[PDB]
C-alpha cells in the first residue's frame, strides 16, 4: 500500500506543480515597488501586502496582545509617581526631571494612549489572540545583542531619559518607508503597509 501511494504521488504532484508554475510564470515586482504580470496588470500594490522579501522575516510575539487590562496597565504605563521606583531604575539627574516637568508626563500619557489604540487595533485584526506573528527584525534579539555588547549590567540605574526613547521611536517610524511620497494617499498607504511592524 505504501509503495503504491508513493508511485501515484510521484505521478500526480509533478503535474500539479507544472500547472502552478505555468499560471504565474511572469508575475514580478517592478521598480515601481508593485507586483504585476506580463500585461502590466497590477495584482498587488505591494508584494505580499507588505513589500518585503520572504528571506529576512522571523517569528516573534506581540507583547501587547492578549494581556489582562490590569497587567497591560501595569506593564506599559511608566508610572511617574513612585519616586523610589524611578530612583531604582533611572538616575537621580533624571528622576527630578521626569517629576517636575509636566511636558514629559503629557508625552508619556500620549504614548500610553497610542499603545492602547494599537492594542485595540491588534485585537480587532488578530482575533483568537494569536501572539505568534512574522516580522522583519527580531527586536528582542537586537536588544539582547546590545546588552551583551555594551555590557548593560541590568542591575545599576541606567541613563536613558524616556523622552529620548519616545523621540527615537518616532524618528525611526519616519525613517522606515515603503510607499515613498508626501501625497495624502501616499502617506495613508505608507502607514497602512507599515502598521503592524510599527
Amino acid at each position: 500500500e505504501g509503495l503504491i501511494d508513493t508511485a501515484v504521488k510521484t505521478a500526480e504532484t509533478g503535474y500539479i506543480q507544472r500547472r502552478l508554475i505555468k499560471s504565474m510564470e511572469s508575475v514580478m515586482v517592478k521598480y515601481d515597488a508593485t507586483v504585476r504580470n506580463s500585461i502590466n496588470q497590477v495584482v498587488q500594490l505591494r508584494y505580499g501586502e507588505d513589500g518585503l522579501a520572504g528571506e529576512s522575516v522571523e517569528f516573534q510575539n506581540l507583547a501587547t496582545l492578549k494581556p489582562s487590562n490590569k497587567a497591560f496597565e501595569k506593564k506599559f504605563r511608566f508610572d511617574y509617581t513612585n519616586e523610589r521606583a524611578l530612583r531604582r531604575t533611572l538616575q537621580e539627574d533624571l528622576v527630578k526631571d521626569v517629576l517636575s516637568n509636566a511636558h514629559i508626563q503629557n508625552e508619556l500619557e500620549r504614548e500610553f494612549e497610542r499603545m492602547r489604540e494599537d492594542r485595540e487595533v491588534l485585537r480587532v485584526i488578530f482575533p483568537t489572540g494569536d501572539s505568534k506573528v512574522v516580522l522583519p527584525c527580531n527586536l528582542l534579539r537586537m536588544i539582547w545583542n546590545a546588552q551583551k555588547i555594551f555590557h548593560i549590567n541590568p542591575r545599576l540605574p541606567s541613563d536613558l531619559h524616556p523622552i529620548k526613547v519616545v523621540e527615537g521611536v518616532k524618528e525611526l517610524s519616519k525613517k522606515l518607508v515603503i510607499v515613498n511620497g508626501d501625497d495624502p494617499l501616499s502617506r495613508q498607504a505608507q502607514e497602512n503597509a507599515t502598521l503592524l511592524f510599527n
Partner: protein
C-alpha cells in the same frame, strides 16, 4: 563565529522544569543558552542545529 546570542530547548527537555526551581540550572543539561557566541548550557540537537 562572532557574538551570537540565542536560546533553544533540547529534545529531552522535561516540560515541568521551567515552572519549578532550577530553571536556570538544569539537572538534565537542557535549555541551550548561547551568549557572545559561547555555548553555556544544554545539549545541541536538531532543534538547535
Amino acid at each position: 563565529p562572532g557574538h551570537i546570542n540565542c536560546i533553544r530547548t533540547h529534545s529531552t527537555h522535561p516540560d515541568d522544569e521551567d515552572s519549578g526551581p532550577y530553571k536556570h540550572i538544569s539537572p538534565g543539561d537542557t535549555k541551550v543558552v548561547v551568549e557572545n557566541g559561547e555555548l553555556i548550557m544544554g545539549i545541541l540537537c536538531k532543534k538547535s542545529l
